[PDB]
Structures are given as structure tokens and as C-alpha cells.
């Protein structure tokens, strides 16, 4: 994290992880590097064909036990969903209503 700084100082490395026994699609990797202008919306695209859904499927991000809306930014997400050292994280189920 010190290095990704160094060069990109102006980014946010996003951890990524899914709900307590989640069940969505498959995913490639857990850390995405966004920059801190992006919105809510943006971030949302680039995992959601990391999550392998598509067309109309269920999905919430989770972050640091909260559930914004679309009106922020993954840089301001930053000092607010942070885990311990710079890194921050944020995580997904397939839904959010009462049931499973």
C-alpha cells in the first residue's frame, strides 16, 4: 500500500469480500483500485461483471456494516468505510430483505 500510494497518491485500493455465506456469481479478484472522484455508480459497474451477474440480478453493497446511496464518491468512501491501514473494505450479498 505504501508503494500504491507513492504512485497513486490520488486513488483508493478498495478491499472486497461478500456477506456471511453469500451466494453470488463468481469474482476475480478482491481489490480494486478506483479513484477517489469516482462515484457510487461507477464502482458499481466495474464489480458487477466481477460478481458474473447480469441482465436483472439481486445485489447490495455492504460497507463498513452501512448502505449508502448513489450519490457519493469511492474517495470520500475512504475515511468513512476504512479497515485498518489505508486499504478500505466493502463486500456484497444477493440480497437484502428478510429471508436468506
Same mark, same amino acid.
Given at each position: 500500500? #505504501? ?32 479513484? &477517489? $472522484?469516482?462515484?457510487?455508480? @461507477? ?13 436483472? $440480478? ?17 474517495? @470520500? ?5 476504512? #479497515?485498518? $491501514? ?6 456484497? &450479498? $444477493?440480497? &437484502?430483505?428478510?429471508?436468506?
Amino acid at each position: 500500500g #505504501e508503494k500504491i500510494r507513492k504512485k497513486y497518491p490520488d486513488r483508493v485500493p478498495v478491499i472486497v469480500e461478500k456477506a456471511p455465506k453469500a451466494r453470488i456469481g463468481d469474482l476475480d479478484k478482491k481489490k480494486y483500485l478506483v479513484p &477517489s $472522484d469516482l462515484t457510487v455508480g @461507477q464502482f458499481y459497474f466495474l464489480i458487477r461483471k466481477r460478481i458474473h451477474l447480469r441482465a436483472e $440480478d439481486a445485489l447490495f453493497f455492504f460497507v463498513n456494516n452501512v448502505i449508502p446511496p448513489t450519490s457519493a464518491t469511492m474517495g @470520500q468512501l475512504y475515511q468513512e468505510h476504512h #479497515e485498518e $491501514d489505508f486499504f478500505l473494505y466493502i463486500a456484497y &450479498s $444477493d440480497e &437484502s430483505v428478510y429471508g436468506l
